[PDB]
Structure formats: structure tokens, C-alpha cells
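Standup notes
- HV: blocked on the assembly model, inputs below
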Amino acid sequence: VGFDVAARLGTLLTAMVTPFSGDGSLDTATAARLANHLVDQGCDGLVVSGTTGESPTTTDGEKIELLRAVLEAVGDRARVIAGAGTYDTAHSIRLAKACAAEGAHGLLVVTPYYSKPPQRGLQAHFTAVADATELPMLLYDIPGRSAVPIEPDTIRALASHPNIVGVKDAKADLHSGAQIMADTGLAYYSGDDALNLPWLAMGATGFISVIAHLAAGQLRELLSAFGSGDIATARKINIAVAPLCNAMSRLGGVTLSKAGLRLQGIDVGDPRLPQVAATPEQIDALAADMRAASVLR
Amino acid sequence: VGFDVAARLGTLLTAMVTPFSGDGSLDTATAARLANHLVDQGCDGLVVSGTTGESPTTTDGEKIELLRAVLEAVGDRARVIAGAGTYDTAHSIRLAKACAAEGAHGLLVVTPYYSKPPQRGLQAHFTAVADATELPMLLYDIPGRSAVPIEPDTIRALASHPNIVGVKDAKADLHSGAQIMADTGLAYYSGDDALNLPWLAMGATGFISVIAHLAAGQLRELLSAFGSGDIATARKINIAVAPLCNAMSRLGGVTLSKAGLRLQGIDVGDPRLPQVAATPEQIDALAADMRAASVLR
Amino acid sequence: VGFDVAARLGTLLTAMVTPFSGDGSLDTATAARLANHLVDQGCDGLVVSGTTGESPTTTDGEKIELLRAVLEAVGDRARVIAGAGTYDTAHSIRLAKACAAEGAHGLLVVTPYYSKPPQRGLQAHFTAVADATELPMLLYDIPGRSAVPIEPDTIRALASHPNIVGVKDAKADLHSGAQIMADTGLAYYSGDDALNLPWLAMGATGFISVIAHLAAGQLRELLSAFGSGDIATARKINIAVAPLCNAMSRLGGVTLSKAGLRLQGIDVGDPRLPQVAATPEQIDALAADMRAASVLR
Amino acid sequence: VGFDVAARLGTLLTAMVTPFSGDGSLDTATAARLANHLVDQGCDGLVVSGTTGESPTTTDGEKIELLRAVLEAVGDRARVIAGAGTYDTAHSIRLAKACAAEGAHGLLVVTPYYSKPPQRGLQAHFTAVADATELPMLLYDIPGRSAVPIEPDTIRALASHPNIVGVKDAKADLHSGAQIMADTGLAYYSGDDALNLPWLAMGATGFISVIAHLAAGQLRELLSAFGSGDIATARKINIAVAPLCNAMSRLGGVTLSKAGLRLQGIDVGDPRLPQVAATPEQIDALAADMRAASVLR
Ligand code: NA
Ligand code: NA
Ligand code: NA
Ligand code: NA
Ligand code: NA
Ligand code: NA
Ligand code: NA
Ligand code: NA
């Protein structure tokens, strides 16, 4: 009205892993160093306690404890987004309020997973979560993980809420997303690194990326080259970071980002169970893809 | 060695809804009345805080608070199984221990959902959960909800753990389940009412049912008729309760069981968000199926 | 009215491979020897030019040429069913008429594949195919191959046609098939060997089997043991032939049956392209499963 | 070497419907008028007897009969591509040779459908089809219809054949297609109108389109605007023709193009069974989308 999601939330965001100490405890120090690193590499925004941040296995206290550690570290020169979504509506209301109290710049609310609620339950869920805080709220539609999509009718109905300002899409329905962007003006962020460039063509605002952990610089130049009309360079850069997308397919984001950051000298620990760290064979394969993406050696 | 899952855990179990007061609070009183009702109707076992018990939206305290309320009510003449599974391994370890401390007769551990861990993460997860307690542990394989299956190799590896004694299957891979039963001797329970009779033919031990909320008597006679070789009667009874399976397809288990119990005079409240209670049109459709199953009017 | 599909079409049918000479020509002689073999092993019916009979790669002339070769060989003591289904309605009308002219005992019409017609196109298709001949017509519902299912409403509408008498189900919707059998009285045949026993429990009439090529005797005893109420023996026999179902999963029916028959001394040739014959590694794996099923060595 | 697929086969191709007379006969006259219309509207290439051309329900003679009618009509100022793919390798060899004898400019070979051959069968199939003619051959990968994909390893192996020059992709794996284009230099054509613009961003050469039947002019300007770096105009035009993509989702290409052409004054007949023509309700919905795309009234 007129909100600017590009400035409010960013254009190159990394869904940051939650670093853990050698014993498994929350490592606030490694979080700030990685937060400064990702911003210094080209990220104007960060998502904390997203999917890749191991939100399933971190407590309410550790989430707020991480949120301030990232805010005081990079909150001056970068936007900080807190993931406040569970399969529990009342819990999501407390998390979004507490994240608001700590001064997070935005909210990322994932589709309630596992329980497979009907669409009107999802609309009532998101409406209640968007009511809890005057922060800008991003819809996070990932049916491959949550077992239900946000249907296009549900997204359009929630588009009229003043706090719901955009969608982080891991559904890959580019034709539907392109029409929702044009019709309602919601800002779309690619929640799928493999489709970053197709999403820009559809009109997306930016990336809430995973391989930005290891290649935020190239992704920044991809966004720059696409906005400046040089599509051949964005495609050239997208082919360059393609091997990191292949490695994410083999490993998944949590295992990839933690094993990849260690090979870049930035040890962030190992994932909490039921997630596991990369095997030696997976590490060597990850490194070959990273040497292909010119982000190793 | 030789464990008897049929006696240890039961043969007709209802994944009991968690009743809620008119304000949304945990209703321990309605839980006992429903627990006595389900046992008096033919259930020799009960599952508390399963999928249908709205485990996503109930606290750790409310789960233990419900567990004792059901144990003191029916624990003498029925087996009580506590669902202790999340996408958080350490949380599942605390829940399974606390449920053990309260004297639950068994554990139901669902495949970690949403985060999509690899198979070796699942094996390490379940192994750590089975280590936490000498209770008999049931695997709960529902890839339609959790977004990952327990592969047959993973089930067989976990079959050698002394506490993992069986599988609640909502995967419908009857050919694989039949071979796992024959090879490892794990007890299978139908986690899909629509496939109750096909599962008995494959060798299942019983039902961890949802429509038993409304038709536990007929399901008991189905198990009786099948064990006594009268397959035509079990099939006759399965056709009789088929409309309740159709209604579960339209509504889902949580909405169906709560709306259905109210129409049977046993008001248990409404589901917690993001789940919703049945609409008037859904209630009238549910009633027509229930009148077809001869469990209404 | 009252038709007896069990006598009209059979109870143990093999979707017979179409044998080919060493040069790829139609081998009528090997067809009769295999037809006599399958009947002498326990099959009271046969399907010619089905999916496993390589209907995609055989001409109209070779189909009729095969139909008479099987009729004169076993048509006295066995039922012969001709597959007359393509994605071409008018072609299916000529094939079903010509198969009728040659005295086939029934028709097997597959869901038109590839072109994905809407349901009313399917209903109009099957209605026109059932009109062309007063032979008993079997619906063949295999959405995994044809890319569209026959919805339950379509099957029920086609159930009132006097020539459409049953369904060969490769859709695995046991709950829907059980209700269609009870409501309309259509005869169901398992088009999925892995679900043969679950289909009997649902009320199926028999098997239109693939692994019967190699284990028709055991399947006959499975049908006998299930009809005589001995479910534990049918399950014991189903576990015995389970390795052949695993091999069919790896290879597919055409490659499995031709490579398996050669190892049983009954060489029937190699499949026509785009299908291929088993590799040496696939042959050795097939043999290990066949030695497990006690149908080799 | 260096082939120019953009000139050899075109950049805006319409998979042309096969027009039929009022009695169902092949209408060569309506084919030429539509062929001249589509070229005069901006199509530099045409595909005959593709999926949308009702290849399942047209004879070998009618296909060649249509091929010459389109060649003599527009073969001077447009490229004509003949679809020569079935689930029958030897049949595909005769069709591709006969289409070559009639002077078609290229071949479109679809993945063998229904029979689900393994990958090495597909590689051997396409290799044998590419051997039959020195025409440029386009791979057509549509697993949603054919029930098997062409795996990326299969496409790369077939990329070294001199006659296989590109891929018509209806698989939507933009990340894989982008890497195959960069690695092997195969020309990709969007076989999915909804993903036309994402495919251009990935580097596709053009569209083998369906909604070009009704909006070839706008699609031409979309290709022009994208090649000239004006991405915002291509996206503006893609949103304009989006309602035609929605109508194709409801109807399918054969029903949409024939019902849509009639509303544009160019009656081409009705589809052959098992396909059906649009219902009055479907016609009115199609017209509303066409009035939205500014291609009606
Ligand atoms: Na959707
Ligand atoms: Na919708
Ligand atoms: Na599995
Ligand atoms: Na496995
Ligand atoms: Na169906
Ligand atoms: Na239907
Ligand atoms: Na593929
Ligand atoms: Na591959």
C-alpha cells in the first residue's frame, strides 16, 4: 500500500542452518560468523529457523535465542526473517509473537505438515497467524514436505490480508504463481534453487536459497544479470551453480549446507537427529560438485 | 521370544481422538467415557495421542495427562498404547520415557514427518527411540503424511531390535508387508480401515482403526469371522462399514470421528486448529453414511 | 442374468506371451505348446494379445492368426479371451468383431492409453466396443500404463451393459473394487499378481496372471485353498510365489515371462522392440527367485 | 556440425490438429487452410500427426495423405515436421521412412507409451528410428502420457546420434533440460505452453505449441520480446495467453484446439473417439478464456 517486499525482506535470502556445538548445543557464536559471512557474500536478507535451519529439532527458546544472535550481528545491514510455522496453530501464534517481540523483520509461516488439514483450515490457520503480528508474513508452500498444497484459491483469499505479503514457493507451479503475482501482487521467492531462473522469468522477487550457503556471490550476480536484462549471463551463472543443485538432490539441504560449509573452512557442526551428517562418500561427491561450481579449492 | 503382540497390544485398537472441552481445554472426563465406551464396544486396546488423537496440537503435559486418564479408566481390561513420535529424536526420547513412567503398555512411533530424513537417519531415530524404554514399540509407516516411507530394508534392520515388535502400516504395500511378516515375524496392524480385510488376508494381527470410533462392534465381528474361517461374513461386514470409509476419505479421521461421535450422542468437542470441525453439509453426508452402516438412527 | 463369469471366462487365466521365432516372426507352434502347457498346469482360461502378449508390437493379422492357433489347441478344454483394446475406438471395433468371427470366448478391452481421454469419452468408447459383439467383455483398468483410470462412476455406468461382465483390475483400489462387486455384481480379476490374495478377500473371481507362466500349479492351489476356507495355506502359497512377483517388479511381465519360460525348457523367443530380453545378470537374478519359488532346478 | 535447429525445424511450431470432415473422414482441404492460417499468423514450422493431431486414431495412409497436403500448402515458407512415433519400433521405422519419402523436413518421435519399456529398450528404439532416415529427429519426452520418462542418461547417450538434434519436453524438468542443453547442445522445444517462458529462460529454441492454434501471433511476439531482451513484455504476453493454458488444463489439447478453432470461424470438425468434442458448458468456458486472451469477439 505500497509495501516494498524487495526492501522489507530482501532479494537474496539464505535459509540459514542453525549451527550446533560439538556436543549438540546451540552455537550462537558460529551463527553470527555465518550470518556476517552470508551478508558479506551478497545476501541482503536471512531466514532463521526455516526448514534448512532444522526448525523441527530446535526448542522455542533456542529459536528466540538464535533470532537475537542474528539480529545483533547483521540486523543493521540485512533483513532477518524468522520462521514461525508448525502444524499447531496456537503454537505458531506464540512463536510469531515472541519473534515479533525480539524485533525480527518478517515472518515465514510454512503450511502445517503431517496432519493434512483441509484448505479452509489452512486459511483459518494463516489468518490467525497473520493476525498475531503486524510483521510482513510470507506464505511457505511446500506440499512435497507438508503433504498438502496451498491451493491457488487459498492463496488469493489470503492475499487480501495486509500482513501476508508474499509466497515462498517450493511447489514449482510456475504457471499458477505467475498468475497469482500478476493478479494479487504478492511477492514470490524461489524456494527451489533448481528453479531460481525460471522463477525470475515468472516475475519472482528473489531467492530464499539453500545453495547460497556456498555460492551466494554467484546467485547475487545471477539476480543482477537478470535484472539488467542480460539473460545469457544469468543462464551462464545458473549452469555454473547447477552441480550444487544436484548435490542438494542427493543430500537434502540440511546435510548439504553443513557438510559444504565445513569444506569451505566454516565448520557449523552436524545436524540434529533424525537428520544425519554426510558420509565420507557423500562428502567427496559434494566436493566434486563444489569444485565444478568453483566454490572449493 | 516368544512375545505375543496380540495379547500385549491388542487385536482391535482405536486410535482415540483427544476430547476437548467447549473452550478447547483437554477434557479428561470425556476421554474416560469414550475409553470405556470403545472397550465396552469390542476394543481390547487403545492408542492415545496418535494421528487421530491430534498429537500435533497437544502439549507434552496434556499427552501424559491424557495417558493416565485412559489408564485408570480402562487399563485393567484393555491395553493402552501411547504415541511417542515426532520429527525430533530427542523429544521422542523424552516422550517415550515419560509415557513409560506413567505405565503405558506400548509405544507407537511415527516416521519423522516434514523434514524427510534419509533412511539411515530413520533407522538411527527408531533405534534411539526403542532404546529409551523396554516397552514394546510399534513402527508407524505412513508416507502419505510424513513424506518418507520406511523402506523394507529399514524395517527388516529394525526388526532385530527386541523392543520393536510390529508395524502399523498406512503405506498399503501389502506384498511387502506380507513378506516382512513371514520373514521377520513382526506383527502388522492395518493403519488403513479401507484395507482392513486385505491386511487380514496378508496375515495382519489387527486394526489400529479410526472408524472403530463408530463401528467397533462390527469390526470385532469382522476379526472374529475372519479368524473363524468365515471369509464371506467378514466381507459382508466390510461392505457394511464401507460407507464410513468413504466418509473418512471426504473428511479425514479427526473431523470424522469427532463429528460422528456427536451424532452418536457422545459429544467429544471440536478439533484444534489447523483442523476444523465438520460443516453442516459434511455432517449430513456423514450421517447418511452412518445410517448406511447401521450405526445411526 | 444369470451369467457365470467363472465358467464363461475362467478362474485361473494366464495373459499369454506371444511367442516369436528366432527371426522375430509369429511362432504359432510354440504358442500351442505353451497353451497346452498352461492349461495342463492348472489354467482353465487364457488371454491372448494382452499387455504381456506384446499387443503393442503385433499386427491385426498376427493377432487373429494367434487366436485360432490357441483356440484349436486348447479351446475345447479351456476358455480363450482375446484382447481387443487400443487407443483407437474404430480400430477396437474391427478387432473385437474379427476376434468374434474367429470364435474367441471373450473380449478384454484395455483403457485407451497415451491420449488421456476424459471419462465420458471412455464410457462412449467401451459402450461402442461392447456393442460390436455379443461376447462377454472384460474391462481392463490399468492407469499406471494408460495414464487414465476408469473412475468408479464410469465402471458403474458401464456395468448395466449386458456384454460388460467384469473388470481386470490393475489399479489396486481394493476398497472401490469391493464396493463395485457388491453393488453391481461385476466379476473382478486380479491384474496384479502381488495382490492376488487381497483381491480374493475382496471377492475377486480369479487371476488374469503373469507369474502363472511359471507357477500356474501353485496359483491353482492358492485359489483352491482360499475357496475351501483354508486361508493359511493360500497365504503360505502366496509367500512361496512372492519371489516371482519381485522379479516381475524388476523386469516387467514381458521380459520376465519369456526369460523365465526359457529357463523352464520352454523357449518362446525374445520380445519385440521397444521391449528387450533379459540381460545375463537379470537372468541369474530371475533364476534365484525361481529357485526360491521351487519352479526351477 | 553446425546444424541450425532454429532454421531446420523452426522456432514457433504448432502441433496441428488433424481436421476431419463432418462424417469423420480426413479433410485435406481444411488442413491446408489451417496450415496457411497458422503460418500467416506467425508459425515458421508445423508438426503434423503429433499428440494434438490425433495420431492414435489416424491410419498410416491418412498420415502420409495429410503430410503431402501440408507440404504442398506451406512447405515453401514453413518447416513441416511429421510425428513418427508409436509403441512399435518396426512400425515407427516404416512411418519415418514413408514420411521421409514424402519430403517431410523433420521427425518427431514420442517415447513408446503404455508398454513401459526399460531405458535400454528406449535407447535401442530411438537409435533404430534415427537410423531409418537422415532427417533431423526430435525426441519427445512426455512421461505423463507415455508412463516412462527418457532419463537424462538416455538423452545424453542419444545426443551423439547425428540425426537426433533436440528434445520436445513435456516433462517440465527445467533443471535437467538446462544442463542437457548446455552439455550436449541439443535444441529444446517447450512441449508445455504453461512453461513456454520458463523454457526460454532455460535456453529453449522455441515452442511446439497447442494454444498457438488460437494465439500464434502473441506467442510470436513473446519469442520476439524475449530474444530482444525485453523480458517484461514476454511476461506481459504470457499473462495475456494464460487463460488459454487454463482452458487446455480443463479440456486437453485436442478438444481445446478443435472447439477453439470453430469459435474463431475456422471449423475443423470434431475429434475421433475415444476423444470427444467440447460440451456447451465447456464451449462457453473456453470462450470466456479466449475473450480474456483477446482472441475472440
Ligand atoms: Na495447489
Ligand atoms: Na483452489
Ligand atoms: Na517403501
Ligand atoms: Na529398502
Ligand atoms: Na479411479
Ligand atoms: Na467417479
Ligand atoms: Na527422467
Ligand atoms: Na538417468
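- HV (later): unblocked. Chain C has one domain: 1-297. Chains C and A do not touch (no CB pair under 8 Å).
- Next: hand off to the docking folks.
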